[PDB]
Amino acid sequence: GITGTWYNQLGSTFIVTAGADGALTGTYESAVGNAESRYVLTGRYDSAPATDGSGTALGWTVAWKNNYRNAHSATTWSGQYVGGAEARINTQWLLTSGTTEANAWKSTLVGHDTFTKVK
Amino acid sequence: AGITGTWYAQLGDTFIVTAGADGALTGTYEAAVGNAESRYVLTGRYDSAPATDGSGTALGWTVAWKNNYRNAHSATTWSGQYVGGAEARINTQWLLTSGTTEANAWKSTLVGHDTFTKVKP
Amino acid sequence: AGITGTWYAQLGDTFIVTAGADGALTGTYEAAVGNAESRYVLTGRYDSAPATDGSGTALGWTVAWKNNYRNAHSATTWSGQYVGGAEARINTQWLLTSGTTEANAWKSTLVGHDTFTKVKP
Amino acid sequence: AGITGTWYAQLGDTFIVTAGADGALTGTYEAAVGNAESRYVLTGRYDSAPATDGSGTALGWTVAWKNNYRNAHSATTWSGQYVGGAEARINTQWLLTSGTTEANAWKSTLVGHDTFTKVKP
């Protein structure tokens, strides 16, 4: 259910491959923030989920550095894939910026993203 | 250079990571228990060209809590920064999401924080 | 300010709040079931002089999950912003902390999000 | 009785709180250098009849960052538990939401953690 292209509510495009033993690999393209073009993503998912109607736990990380720019920051998404006719990946995310020690307390933004298979 | 090696959490957990020249993090996370049955694959990303100014290096990684022995139907992501020097640290916040039914989705995700050091607590 | 009145969560919950002239939020939160054992005191604060540039109005509140009928030994805080207009919303993220032993403190806190609207979902 | 008094954050901030018989938290938060332009109203709730099994006492509170002297158009909520004994502490996680435009809403909310103690660190 997981492998393929996913779209967030704000325009961002997540292209992922789910490996048979739990690897997530792919690319992320953000429509907002200090970002441009595509960024490598890597993560993990539960490759043997329950069959009781539960979602499939997963997570991945993007470091906001590519050949175009470097935002000195990284976002992790943690959530679950929910299959069926209206399939979705429901996430919460943490975006941590590299900071000085004086600004560490404000290094990390939190949010949520629901991804769907259609725009 | 600074990131690659072994890191210890405040409560006994250990992880060993290699930081690739182009931003990959790969390694193993070992829950406090200490045995093989408590070792899990870790994968993530870091800023491989960080600011050269005394600021942290941004990073994140994921562990799905499934290995050859156990499966919690859960995954944790840590988001943070590495701070180098005599008392080097990785300061993180994490989210642990469990697979749930739709009715219980509201209570799927735990949040916390952890500081990792190069020496045991 | 547009905050005073009734708000509805995505999953059935209702709260009724008064926003005081000097930044107080006071009211009652009613869990989705809306029976008589589902009402709890809420208290919080908001920006009583927000920006006039089109920005939202920052606010937060807490409910401790104890009333005359039951005690869940837990508390939720919501942090967010009020957005006024034809489709007014309060956009929030929340943290629900349960009383735990030290051993289980790592799993004490759930995180989530909710959007409150002036009409039912 | 355990909660009422002065608490110190790791970073230098101070707050003074009274815990009411029926679950109210009321007080003042001081972000250094505390004189007045640094003092803010805090209000929240706590579990006034916590479990007797060794669990912490759940609580939460909000500060909107406006006073008679300044206004940051933001609000922080802390969610945590009070743990009593010789080394009493309030262990929290917090959310700080700023008023934003709709375009900037995605970056409206900071997350962190604060452990408060009865002696300054």
* Residue D33, preceding peptide bond in cis (omega within 30° of 0): yes
Say which amino acid occupies C65: W
The whole-angstrom separation of Cα B46 and Cα A98 is: 10
Alpha carbons C61 and C29: distance in angstroms, whole number: 10
Of C62, C66, C101, Cβ closest to residue D55: C101
φ, ψ dihedrals at D109, nearest 5° = -130, 120
D61 is in an annotated binding site: no
Q: C92: which residues sit within 8 A by CB, 6+ positions away? A: C78, C79, C80, C113, C114, C115, C116
In whole angstroms, what is the distance from residue C103 CA to residue C77 CA? 23
**Cβ–Cβ below 8 Å for B111 and D111:** yes
Q: Among candidates C102, C100, C98, which has minimal Cα distance to C111?
A: C98
Q: Could you report how far apart the first and last alpha carbons of chain B are, in Å? A: 23
How far is Cα B100 from Cα A18, in angstroms, rounded to an integer?
20
Question: Tokens 């790592």 correspond to what residue?
Answer: C106
Cβ atoms < 10 Å from Cβ of D85: 7
B1-121 to CATH, choices 2.60.40.10, 2.60.60.20, 3.40.50.720, 2.40.128.30: 2.40.128.30
CA distances for D117 relative to A92, B100, C76, C77, D92, angstroms: 30, 36, 22, 21, 11
Q: Which residues contact A103 (CB under 8 A, 6 or more apart)?
A: none
CATH class of the structural domain A1-119? mainly beta
Residue A105: count of CB within 10 angstroms of its CB:
18
CB atoms within 10 A of CB D14: 18
Shortest alpha-carbon distance between residue C77 and chain A (Å): 15
Residue C108: C-alpha distances to residues B110, B112, D5 (Å): 8, 9, 24
Resolution of the structure in the document, Å: 1.6
Cα–Cα distance between D15 and B80 in angstroms, integer?
A: 28
Closest residue of chain B to A81, computed from CA coordinates: B99
Contacts of C41 (CB under 8 A, 6+ apart): C28, C29, C63, C64, C67, D23, D45
Chains that touch D (3 or more CB pairs under 8 A): A, B, C
Experimental method: X-ray
Q: Which two tokens stand for residue D10?
A: 């790791």
Q: Are strands B109-117 and D5-8 parallel, antiparallel or unpaired?
A: unpaired
Q: Please, what's the largest Cα pairwise distance for chain B?
A: 48
| Greatest extent of chain C over all pairs of C-alpha atoms, in Å | 48
Tell me if D29 is assigned to a ligand binding site: yes
User: Which of A33, A105, A111 shows the shortest C-beta gap to D112?
Assistant: A105
Q: What 3 state SS string does B98-110 have?
A: ECCCCCCHHHCEE
According to DSSP, residue B10 is labeled: T
Q: Which residues does residue B66 pair with via DSSP β-bridges, in sequence order? A: B71
Contacts of C111 in chain A (CB under 8 A): 92, 110
> What is the Cα–Cα distance from D121 to D116, expressed in whole angstroms?
9
B47–chain C nearest CA distance, Å: 27
Q: Is A93 annotated as a binding residue?
A: yes
Q: Give residue A76's Cα distance to chain centre.
A: 6
In angstroms, how far is CA C119 from the centroid of its own chain? 16
Name chain B contacts of C106, Cβ cutoff 8 Å.
Answer: 11, 110, 112
Q: How far is C88 from chain B (nearest CA, A)?
A: 23
Of D35, D113, C52, whose CA–CA distance to B79 is shortest?
A: D113
- Per the annotation, does D40 bind a ligand? yes
Angle at D78 between CA A32 and CA D89, to 5 degrees: 135
The verdict on a CB contact (< 8 Å) between A111 and D106 is yes
Cross-strand pairs, D46: D59
By three-state DSSP, how is residue D34 classified? coil
Chain D: give the shortest CA distance to residue A109, in Å.
4
Q: Which two tokens stand for residue C96?
A: 């629900």
Secondary element (H or E) of residue D90: strand D89-98
A33-65 burial, b if ≥16 CB within 10 A, otherwise e?
bebeebbbbbbbbbbebbeeebbbbbbbbbbbb
The CA distance from C50 to C57, in Å, is 6
Distance from the first to the final alpha carbon of chain D: 23
Nearest to C14 by CA among C46, C39, C44, C43: C39
Quote the Cα angle for C60-A110-D75, to 5°: 25
| Domain residue extents for chain A | 1-119
Cβ–Cβ below 8 Å for B93 and A94: yes
Nearest alpha carbon to residue B99 among A80, A115, A45: A80
